[PDB]
PDB file of N, CA and C and ligand atoms in Angstrom:
ATOM      1  N   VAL A   1      29.570  -7.883 -37.480  1.00  0.00           N
ATOM      2  CA  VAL A   1      30.811  -7.315 -36.584  1.00  0.00           C
ATOM      3  C   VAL A   1      30.305  -7.501 -35.112  1.00  0.00           C
ATOM      4  N   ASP A   2      31.190  -7.153 -34.384  1.00  0.00           N
ATOM      5  CA  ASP A   2      31.061  -7.174 -32.718  1.00  0.00           C
ATOM      6  C   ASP A   2      29.653  -6.453 -32.555  1.00  0.00           C
ATOM      7  N   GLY A   3      29.071  -7.003 -31.678  1.00  0.00           N
ATOM      8  CA  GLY A   3      27.891  -6.306 -31.226  1.00  0.00           C
ATOM      9  C   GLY A   3      28.096  -5.454 -30.134  1.00  0.00           C
ATOM     10  N   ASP A   4      26.763  -4.939 -29.542  1.00  0.00           N
ATOM     11  CA  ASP A   4      27.061  -3.767 -28.425  1.00  0.00           C
ATOM     12  C   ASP A   4      27.050  -4.293 -26.993  1.00  0.00           C
ATOM     13  N   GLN A   5      28.261  -4.310 -26.337  1.00  0.00           N
ATOM     14  CA  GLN A   5      28.443  -4.945 -24.943  1.00  0.00           C
ATOM     15  C   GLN A   5      27.538  -3.985 -23.922  1.00  0.00           C
ATOM     16  N   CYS A   6      27.167  -2.888 -24.312  1.00  0.00           N
ATOM     17  CA  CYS A   6      26.546  -1.834 -23.332  1.00  0.00           C
ATOM     18  C   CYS A   6      24.825  -2.292 -23.294  1.00  0.00           C
ATOM     19  N   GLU A   7      24.417  -3.050 -24.131  1.00  0.00           N
ATOM     20  CA  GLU A   7      23.085  -3.371 -24.539  1.00  0.00           C
ATOM     21  C   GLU A   7      22.331  -3.859 -23.191  1.00  0.00           C
ATOM     22  N   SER A   8      22.952  -4.299 -22.460  1.00  0.00           N
ATOM     23  CA  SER A   8      22.508  -4.965 -20.782  1.00  0.00           C
ATOM     24  C   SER A   8      22.770  -4.059 -19.831  1.00  0.00           C
ATOM     25  N   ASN A   9      23.437  -3.063 -20.157  1.00  0.00           N
ATOM     26  CA  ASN A   9      23.474  -1.862 -19.090  1.00  0.00           C
ATOM     27  C   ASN A   9      24.191  -2.248 -18.042  1.00  0.00           C
ATOM     28  N   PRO A  10      25.624  -2.492 -18.414  1.00  0.00           N
ATOM     29  CA  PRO A  10      26.575  -3.523 -17.671  1.00  0.00           C
ATOM     30  C   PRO A  10      26.959  -2.176 -16.393  1.00  0.00           C
ATOM     31  N   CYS A  11      26.777  -0.817 -16.759  1.00  0.00           N
ATOM     32  CA  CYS A  11      27.344  -0.026 -15.733  1.00  0.00           C
ATOM     33  C   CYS A  11      26.210   0.420 -14.688  1.00  0.00           C
ATOM     34  N   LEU A  12      26.658   0.117 -13.530  1.00  0.00           N
ATOM     35  CA  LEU A  12      25.696   0.451 -12.336  1.00  0.00           C
ATOM     36  C   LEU A  12      25.719   2.098 -12.201  1.00  0.00           C
ATOM     37  N   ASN A  13      24.861   2.393 -11.324  1.00  0.00           N
ATOM     38  CA  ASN A  13      24.717   3.490 -10.740  1.00  0.00           C
ATOM     39  C   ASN A  13      24.735   4.712 -11.516  1.00  0.00           C
ATOM     40  N   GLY A  14      24.348   4.795 -12.549  1.00  0.00           N
ATOM     41  CA  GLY A  14      24.184   5.991 -13.251  1.00  0.00           C
ATOM     42  C   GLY A  14      25.403   6.174 -14.303  1.00  0.00           C
ATOM     43  N   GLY A  15      26.376   5.121 -14.237  1.00  0.00           N
ATOM     44  CA  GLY A  15      27.585   4.916 -15.197  1.00  0.00           C
ATOM     45  C   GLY A  15      27.283   4.980 -16.560  1.00  0.00           C
ATOM     46  N   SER A  16      27.992   5.794 -17.445  1.00  0.00           N
ATOM     47  CA  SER A  16      27.853   5.830 -18.629  1.00  0.00           C
ATOM     48  C   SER A  16      28.711   4.665 -19.478  1.00  0.00           C
ATOM     49  N   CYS A  17      27.933   3.988 -20.223  1.00  0.00           N
ATOM     50  CA  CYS A  17      28.731   2.701 -20.857  1.00  0.00           C
ATOM     51  C   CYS A  17      29.157   3.215 -22.360  1.00  0.00           C
ATOM     52  N   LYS A  18      30.278   2.761 -22.629  1.00  0.00           N
ATOM     53  CA  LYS A  18      30.920   3.043 -24.062  1.00  0.00           C
ATOM     54  C   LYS A  18      31.416   1.707 -24.465  1.00  0.00           C
ATOM     55  N   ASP A  19      30.700   1.129 -25.654  1.00  0.00           N
ATOM     56  CA  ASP A  19      31.015  -0.079 -26.262  1.00  0.00           C
ATOM     57  C   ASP A  19      32.448   0.092 -26.970  1.00  0.00           C
ATOM     58  N   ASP A  20      33.085  -1.278 -26.619  1.00  0.00           N
ATOM     59  CA  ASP A  20      34.537  -1.500 -27.440  1.00  0.00           C
ATOM     60  C   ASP A  20      34.300  -2.522 -28.003  1.00  0.00           C
ATOM     61  N   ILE A  21      35.469  -3.255 -28.437  1.00  0.00           N
ATOM     62  CA  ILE A  21      35.362  -4.423 -29.275  1.00  0.00           C
ATOM     63  C   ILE A  21      35.334  -5.585 -28.405  1.00  0.00           C
ATOM     64  N   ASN A  22      34.507  -6.323 -28.220  1.00  0.00           N
ATOM     65  CA  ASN A  22      34.119  -7.435 -27.250  1.00  0.00           C
ATOM     66  C   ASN A  22      34.418  -7.057 -25.748  1.00  0.00           C
ATOM     67  N   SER A  23      34.052  -5.814 -25.359  1.00  0.00           N
ATOM     68  CA  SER A  23      34.008  -5.236 -24.215  1.00  0.00           C
ATOM     69  C   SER A  23      33.601  -4.061 -24.121  1.00  0.00           C
ATOM     70  N   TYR A  24      33.304  -3.353 -22.763  1.00  0.00           N
ATOM     71  CA  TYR A  24      33.035  -2.134 -22.692  1.00  0.00           C
ATOM     72  C   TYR A  24      33.770  -1.486 -21.537  1.00  0.00           C
ATOM     73  N   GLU A  25      33.517  -0.034 -21.563  1.00  0.00           N
ATOM     74  CA  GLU A  25      34.234   0.757 -20.547  1.00  0.00           C
ATOM     75  C   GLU A  25      32.951   1.325 -19.811  1.00  0.00           C
ATOM     76  N   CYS A  26      32.646   1.553 -18.416  1.00  0.00           N
ATOM     77  CA  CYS A  26      32.029   2.354 -17.736  1.00  0.00           C
ATOM     78  C   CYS A  26      32.589   3.684 -17.199  1.00  0.00           C
ATOM     79  N   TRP A  27      32.022   4.832 -17.694  1.00  0.00           N
ATOM     80  CA  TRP A  27      32.367   6.286 -16.934  1.00  0.00           C
ATOM     81  C   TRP A  27      31.454   6.312 -16.043  1.00  0.00           C
ATOM     82  N   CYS A  28      32.073   6.375 -14.687  1.00  0.00           N
ATOM     83  CA  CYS A  28      31.308   6.342 -13.395  1.00  0.00           C
ATOM     84  C   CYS A  28      31.124   7.717 -12.847  1.00  0.00           C
ATOM     85  N   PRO A  29      29.885   8.173 -12.248  1.00  0.00           N
ATOM     86  CA  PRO A  29      29.661   9.449 -11.375  1.00  0.00           C
ATOM     87  C   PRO A  29      31.040   9.558 -10.399  1.00  0.00           C
ATOM     88  N   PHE A  30      31.462  10.599 -10.026  1.00  0.00           N
ATOM     89  CA  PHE A  30      32.579  10.882  -8.912  1.00  0.00           C
ATOM     90  C   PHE A  30      32.050  10.039  -7.973  1.00  0.00           C
ATOM     91  N   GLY A  31      33.132   9.217  -7.489  1.00  0.00           N
ATOM     92  CA  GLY A  31      33.127   8.649  -6.235  1.00  0.00           C
ATOM     93  C   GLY A  31      32.308   7.224  -6.122  1.00  0.00           C
ATOM     94  N   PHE A  32      31.951   6.985  -7.645  1.00  0.00           N
ATOM     95  CA  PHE A  32      31.704   5.667  -7.889  1.00  0.00           C
ATOM     96  C   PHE A  32      32.986   4.968  -8.697  1.00  0.00           C
ATOM     97  N   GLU A  33      33.487   3.644  -8.360  1.00  0.00           N
ATOM     98  CA  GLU A  33      34.811   3.323  -9.054  1.00  0.00           C
ATOM     99  C   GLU A  33      34.183   1.820  -9.218  1.00  0.00           C
ATOM    100  N   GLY A  34      35.456   0.759  -9.716  1.00  0.00           N
ATOM    101  CA  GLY A  34      34.927  -0.612 -10.038  1.00  0.00           C
ATOM    102  C   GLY A  34      34.763  -0.398 -11.583  1.00  0.00           C
ATOM    103  N   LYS A  35      35.021  -1.560 -12.291  1.00  0.00           N
ATOM    104  CA  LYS A  35      34.886  -1.512 -13.750  1.00  0.00           C
ATOM    105  C   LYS A  35      33.382  -1.453 -14.012  1.00  0.00           C
ATOM    106  N   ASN A  36      32.478  -1.790 -12.985  1.00  0.00           N
ATOM    107  CA  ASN A  36      30.818  -1.217 -13.363  1.00  0.00           C
ATOM    108  C   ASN A  36      30.366  -0.286 -12.420  1.00  0.00           C
ATOM    109  N   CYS A  37      31.201   0.779 -11.928  1.00  0.00           N
ATOM    110  CA  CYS A  37      30.920   1.619 -11.183  1.00  0.00           C
ATOM    111  C   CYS A  37      29.872   1.038  -9.670  1.00  0.00           C
ATOM    112  N   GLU A  38      30.488  -0.151  -9.228  1.00  0.00           N
ATOM    113  CA  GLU A  38      29.750  -1.030  -8.078  1.00  0.00           C
ATOM    114  C   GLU A  38      30.288  -0.404  -7.059  1.00  0.00           C
ATOM    115  N   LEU A  39      31.551   0.141  -6.732  1.00  0.00           N
ATOM    116  CA  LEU A  39      32.289   0.658  -5.703  1.00  0.00           C
ATOM    117  C   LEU A  39      32.033   2.313  -5.245  1.00  0.00           C
TER     118      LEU A  39
ATOM    119  N   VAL B   1      29.037   1.075  -2.006  1.00  0.00           N
ATOM    120  CA  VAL B   1      28.268   1.925  -1.705  1.00  0.00           C
ATOM    121  C   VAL B   1      26.762   1.842  -2.119  1.00  0.00           C
ATOM    122  N   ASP B   2      26.187   2.383  -3.168  1.00  0.00           N
ATOM    123  CA  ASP B   2      25.096   1.953  -3.729  1.00  0.00           C
ATOM    124  C   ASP B   2      24.897   0.732  -4.540  1.00  0.00           C
ATOM    125  N   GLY B   3      23.860  -0.121  -3.989  1.00  0.00           N
ATOM    126  CA  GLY B   3      23.820  -1.216  -4.814  1.00  0.00           C
ATOM    127  C   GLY B   3      23.158  -1.285  -6.225  1.00  0.00           C
ATOM    128  N   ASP B   4      22.741  -2.636  -6.703  1.00  0.00           N
ATOM    129  CA  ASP B   4      22.179  -2.647  -8.013  1.00  0.00           C
ATOM    130  C   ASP B   4      20.626  -2.913  -7.872  1.00  0.00           C
ATOM    131  N   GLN B   5      19.788  -1.823  -8.151  1.00  0.00           N
ATOM    132  CA  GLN B   5      18.439  -2.013  -7.817  1.00  0.00           C
ATOM    133  C   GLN B   5      17.511  -2.691  -8.777  1.00  0.00           C
ATOM    134  N   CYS B   6      18.517  -2.955  -9.823  1.00  0.00           N
ATOM    135  CA  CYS B   6      17.955  -3.971 -10.999  1.00  0.00           C
ATOM    136  C   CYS B   6      17.975  -5.443 -10.174  1.00  0.00           C
ATOM    137  N   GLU B   7      18.466  -5.755  -9.140  1.00  0.00           N
ATOM    138  CA  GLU B   7      18.550  -7.109  -8.525  1.00  0.00           C
ATOM    139  C   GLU B   7      17.033  -7.704  -8.525  1.00  0.00           C
ATOM    140  N   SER B   8      16.963  -8.891  -8.893  1.00  0.00           N
ATOM    141  CA  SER B   8      15.471  -9.249  -9.068  1.00  0.00           C
ATOM    142  C   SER B   8      14.877  -8.980 -10.025  1.00  0.00           C
ATOM    143  N   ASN B   9      15.060  -8.358 -11.015  1.00  0.00           N
ATOM    144  CA  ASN B   9      14.704  -7.985 -12.318  1.00  0.00           C
ATOM    145  C   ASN B   9      13.148  -7.618 -12.027  1.00  0.00           C
ATOM    146  N   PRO B  10      13.298  -6.309 -11.782  1.00  0.00           N
ATOM    147  CA  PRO B  10      11.671  -5.489 -11.587  1.00  0.00           C
ATOM    148  C   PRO B  10      11.145  -5.070 -12.781  1.00  0.00           C
ATOM    149  N   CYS B  11      11.645  -5.006 -14.005  1.00  0.00           N
ATOM    150  CA  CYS B  11      10.856  -4.836 -15.250  1.00  0.00           C
ATOM    151  C   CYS B  11      10.289  -6.007 -15.727  1.00  0.00           C
ATOM    152  N   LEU B  12       9.100  -6.123 -16.017  1.00  0.00           N
ATOM    153  CA  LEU B  12       8.297  -7.078 -16.555  1.00  0.00           C
ATOM    154  C   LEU B  12       8.387  -7.015 -18.019  1.00  0.00           C
ATOM    155  N   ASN B  13       7.882  -8.385 -18.550  1.00  0.00           N
ATOM    156  CA  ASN B  13       7.553  -8.289 -19.968  1.00  0.00           C
ATOM    157  C   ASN B  13       8.581  -7.930 -20.903  1.00  0.00           C
ATOM    158  N   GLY B  14       9.791  -8.335 -20.772  1.00  0.00           N
ATOM    159  CA  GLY B  14      10.864  -8.361 -21.755  1.00  0.00           C
ATOM    160  C   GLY B  14      11.578  -6.856 -21.544  1.00  0.00           C
ATOM    161  N   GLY B  15      10.960  -6.055 -20.615  1.00  0.00           N
ATOM    162  CA  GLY B  15      11.721  -4.541 -20.389  1.00  0.00           C
ATOM    163  C   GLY B  15      13.246  -4.949 -19.883  1.00  0.00           C
ATOM    164  N   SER B  16      13.815  -3.732 -19.887  1.00  0.00           N
ATOM    165  CA  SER B  16      15.344  -3.875 -19.756  1.00  0.00           C
ATOM    166  C   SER B  16      15.295  -2.633 -18.740  1.00  0.00           C
ATOM    167  N   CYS B  17      16.272  -3.130 -17.665  1.00  0.00           N
ATOM    168  CA  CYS B  17      16.393  -2.568 -16.424  1.00  0.00           C
ATOM    169  C   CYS B  17      17.699  -1.638 -16.639  1.00  0.00           C
ATOM    170  N   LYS B  18      17.833  -0.437 -16.014  1.00  0.00           N
ATOM    171  CA  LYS B  18      19.070   0.274 -16.013  1.00  0.00           C
ATOM    172  C   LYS B  18      19.156   0.679 -14.407  1.00  0.00           C
ATOM    173  N   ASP B  19      20.235   0.579 -13.978  1.00  0.00           N
ATOM    174  CA  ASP B  19      20.787   0.866 -12.248  1.00  0.00           C
ATOM    175  C   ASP B  19      20.776   2.315 -12.393  1.00  0.00           C
ATOM    176  N   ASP B  20      20.134   2.966 -11.375  1.00  0.00           N
ATOM    177  CA  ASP B  20      20.391   4.287 -11.102  1.00  0.00           C
ATOM    178  C   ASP B  20      21.028   4.268  -9.734  1.00  0.00           C
ATOM    179  N   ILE B  21      20.875   5.417  -8.941  1.00  0.00           N
ATOM    180  CA  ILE B  21      21.501   5.682  -7.611  1.00  0.00           C
ATOM    181  C   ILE B  21      20.188   5.651  -6.986  1.00  0.00           C
ATOM    182  N   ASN B  22      20.156   4.503  -6.248  1.00  0.00           N
ATOM    183  CA  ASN B  22      19.142   4.055  -5.153  1.00  0.00           C
ATOM    184  C   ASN B  22      17.848   4.204  -5.956  1.00  0.00           C
ATOM    185  N   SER B  23      17.777   3.752  -7.141  1.00  0.00           N
ATOM    186  CA  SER B  23      16.518   3.633  -8.003  1.00  0.00           C
ATOM    187  C   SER B  23      16.895   2.885  -9.055  1.00  0.00           C
ATOM    188  N   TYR B  24      16.181   2.653 -10.090  1.00  0.00           N
ATOM    189  CA  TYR B  24      16.261   1.964 -11.296  1.00  0.00           C
ATOM    190  C   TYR B  24      15.043   2.399 -12.525  1.00  0.00           C
ATOM    191  N   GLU B  25      15.511   2.322 -13.486  1.00  0.00           N
ATOM    192  CA  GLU B  25      14.584   2.726 -14.501  1.00  0.00           C
ATOM    193  C   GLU B  25      14.244   1.595 -15.588  1.00  0.00           C
ATOM    194  N   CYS B  26      12.959   1.323 -15.755  1.00  0.00           N
ATOM    195  CA  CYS B  26      12.713   0.208 -17.122  1.00  0.00           C
ATOM    196  C   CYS B  26      12.651   0.948 -18.409  1.00  0.00           C
ATOM    197  N   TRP B  27      13.179   0.304 -19.380  1.00  0.00           N
ATOM    198  CA  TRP B  27      12.518   0.414 -20.716  1.00  0.00           C
ATOM    199  C   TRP B  27      11.522  -0.458 -21.120  1.00  0.00           C
ATOM    200  N   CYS B  28      10.459  -0.374 -21.611  1.00  0.00           N
ATOM    201  CA  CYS B  28       9.513  -1.176 -21.463  1.00  0.00           C
ATOM    202  C   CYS B  28       9.293  -1.419 -23.313  1.00  0.00           C
ATOM    203  N   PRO B  29       8.885  -2.583 -23.841  1.00  0.00           N
ATOM    204  CA  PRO B  29       8.686  -3.048 -25.189  1.00  0.00           C
ATOM    205  C   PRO B  29       7.449  -1.914 -25.729  1.00  0.00           C
ATOM    206  N   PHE B  30       7.380  -1.814 -27.160  1.00  0.00           N
ATOM    207  CA  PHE B  30       6.252  -1.102 -27.526  1.00  0.00           C
ATOM    208  C   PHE B  30       4.706  -1.894 -26.894  1.00  0.00           C
ATOM    209  N   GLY B  31       3.976  -0.963 -26.302  1.00  0.00           N
ATOM    210  CA  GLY B  31       2.740  -1.506 -26.016  1.00  0.00           C
ATOM    211  C   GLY B  31       2.565  -1.572 -24.592  1.00  0.00           C
ATOM    212  N   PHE B  32       3.656  -1.433 -23.806  1.00  0.00           N
ATOM    213  CA  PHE B  32       3.700  -1.703 -22.334  1.00  0.00           C
ATOM    214  C   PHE B  32       4.088  -0.430 -21.788  1.00  0.00           C
ATOM    215  N   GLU B  33       3.598  -0.045 -20.535  1.00  0.00           N
ATOM    216  CA  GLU B  33       3.951   1.034 -19.710  1.00  0.00           C
ATOM    217  C   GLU B  33       3.874   0.695 -18.226  1.00  0.00           C
ATOM    218  N   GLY B  34       3.880   1.768 -17.307  1.00  0.00           N
ATOM    219  CA  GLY B  34       4.095   1.431 -16.101  1.00  0.00           C
ATOM    220  C   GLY B  34       5.360   1.511 -15.632  1.00  0.00           C
ATOM    221  N   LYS B  35       5.702   1.876 -14.383  1.00  0.00           N
ATOM    222  CA  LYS B  35       7.092   1.630 -13.742  1.00  0.00           C
ATOM    223  C   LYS B  35       7.906   0.438 -14.251  1.00  0.00           C
ATOM    224  N   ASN B  36       7.087  -0.425 -14.225  1.00  0.00           N
ATOM    225  CA  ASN B  36       7.754  -1.845 -14.381  1.00  0.00           C
ATOM    226  C   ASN B  36       7.179  -2.596 -15.558  1.00  0.00           C
ATOM    227  N   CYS B  37       6.696  -1.977 -16.529  1.00  0.00           N
ATOM    228  CA  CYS B  37       6.203  -2.569 -17.828  1.00  0.00           C
ATOM    229  C   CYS B  37       4.915  -3.393 -17.372  1.00  0.00           C
ATOM    230  N   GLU B  38       4.282  -3.136 -16.352  1.00  0.00           N
ATOM    231  CA  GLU B  38       3.222  -3.954 -16.013  1.00  0.00           C
ATOM    232  C   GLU B  38       1.757  -3.662 -16.462  1.00  0.00           C
ATOM    233  N   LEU B  39       1.758  -2.436 -16.985  1.00  0.00           N
ATOM    234  CA  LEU B  39       0.655  -1.784 -17.532  1.00  0.00           C
ATOM    235  C   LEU B  39       0.449  -1.897 -19.018  1.00  0.00           C
TER     236      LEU B  39
HETATM  237 CA1   CA C 101      31.183  -3.943 -29.079  1.00  0.00          CA
HETATM  238 CA1   CA C 102      12.129 -10.789  -9.133  1.00  0.00          CA
HETATM  239 CA1   CA C 103      22.164   1.708  -7.789  1.00  0.00          CA
END
């Protein structure tokens, strides 16, 4: 089944990665935004 | 704001880089150590 899309640490800047099905979400610290916390 | 300090792949020897705020961390394979898995 689907693997772990967080294994590559896609979330920058201390963001917490949650694995989804063929995708991932980043939970960013306050005041970082963007899909990977890059803003 | 803060950039991706994993730019340029600082972790050696198969290590995995995680971007933090103004810093990065490496996970290193068993048998390797140092900040950048260089020891
Ligand atoms: Ca997945
Ligand atoms: Ca390099
Ligand atoms: Ca960073």
